[PDB]
């Protein structure tokens, strides 16, 4: 029974979205993952309607997307993490209406594997470095450089592997033009595996670890690591340098916490609940996703709860120190 497969209706569900000047022009597009398909969208700022410019079956499981830009560049690259086990960088070519594969670097076997990288993708804001991280143990960092011709160049991967470590999320920290840093929410599971009582599992704490890439010495150092009060589900990169105070918001169960390395104290804000909520009181509340808006003189985050309620989040600063997190309810 020989058979021919045809798609009639492409998948419509979205699992990742990134925004950027993928065309290399003033206007912004959105690249969306539909799991098996990569798609480019243009919202028309006049008509409001959203136009699908390009759809490509990638015959793989997309697991992470990041936009990134080399310092000085006009155009955003798409870096893709997938079940393939190869880190792929794409450039949208507006003239040919195609995604062009600028680099493909190989680091492991294929499938949605536990210890092979691809699930988590973090890029330095300046675009200097990209870190691809597996759920467990294996994390790899690729340095990014611009050649004379302005074509993209990918450095050989630098190993940053810590055994028995589960990673919940990784984000690039904005350090301005200092050495790139990545932040990971990680839990070490070695003690739970060796404790017959189960106390070790209960007393295992997630840590926030900052891995710094010393660009000069080509090595990745696990420079700071710190236990959190409660388990975070994801991280948000806070604007750094001139733009902001740097650091990373941890979204966690019932809370949002701001952390930075050095003299910066922890600031923690509870997630506001709905008045008269009919929900089961045993249920905690998490933020499910976030967007950042960075503007010429200010920034804010939008973060959405499990109920669909969006909070605008702002950070008050005195000198370069955050002093409070402010949450205004925005919309549902």
């Amino acid at each position: 029974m020989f058979l021919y497969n045809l798609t009639l209706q492409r998948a419509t569900g979205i699992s990742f979205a990134i925004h950027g000047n993928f065309s290399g022009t003033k206007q912004q597009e959105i690249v969306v993952s539909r799991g098996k398909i990569l798609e480019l969208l243009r919202p028309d700022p006049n008509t409001g309607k959203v136009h699908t410019l390009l759809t490509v079956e990638v015959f793989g499981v997309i697991r992470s997307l990041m936009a990134f830009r080399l310092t000085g560049g006009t155009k955003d690259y798409i870096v893709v993490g997938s079940d393939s086990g190869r880190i792929v960088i794409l450039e949208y070519q507006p003239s040919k209406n195609m995604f062009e594969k600028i680099h493909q670097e190989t680091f492991g076997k294929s499938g949605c594997r536990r210890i092979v990288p691809g699930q988590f993708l973090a890029v330095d804001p300046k675009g200097r470095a990209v870190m691809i991280s597996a759920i467990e143990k294996q994390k790899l960092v690729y340095i990014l450089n611009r050649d004379a011709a302005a074509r993209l160049t990918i450095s050989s991967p630098l190993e940053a592997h810590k055994a028995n470590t589960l990673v919940y999320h990784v984000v690039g920290v904005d350090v301005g033009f200092e050495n790139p840093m990545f932040a990971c929410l990680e839990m070490d599971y070695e003690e739970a595996d060796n404790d017959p009582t189960g106390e070790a599992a209960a007393n295992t704490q997630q840590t926030l670890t900052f891995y710094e890439l010393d660009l000069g010495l080509n090595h990745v150092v696990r420079k700071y690591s710190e236990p959190l009060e409660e388990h975070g589900n994801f991280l948000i990169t806070v604007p750094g340098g001139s733009d902001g105070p740097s650091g990373v918001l941890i979204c966690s169960e019932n809370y949002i916490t701001y952390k930075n390395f050095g003299d910066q104290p922890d600031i923690r804000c509870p997630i506001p609940r709905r008045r008269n909520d009919l929900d089961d009181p045993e249920r905690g509340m998490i933020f499910v996703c976030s967007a950042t808006h960075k503007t010429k003189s200010m920034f804010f985050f939008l973060a959405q709860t499990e109920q669909g309620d969006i909070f605008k989040i702002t950070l008050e600063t005195d000198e370069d120190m955050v002093t409070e997190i402010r949450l205004k309810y925005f919309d549902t």
Partner: peptide
């Protein structure tokens, strides 16, 4: 340094 000069 090469192109790493650019922000400085």
């Amino acid at each position: 340094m090469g192109c790493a000069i650019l922000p400085h």
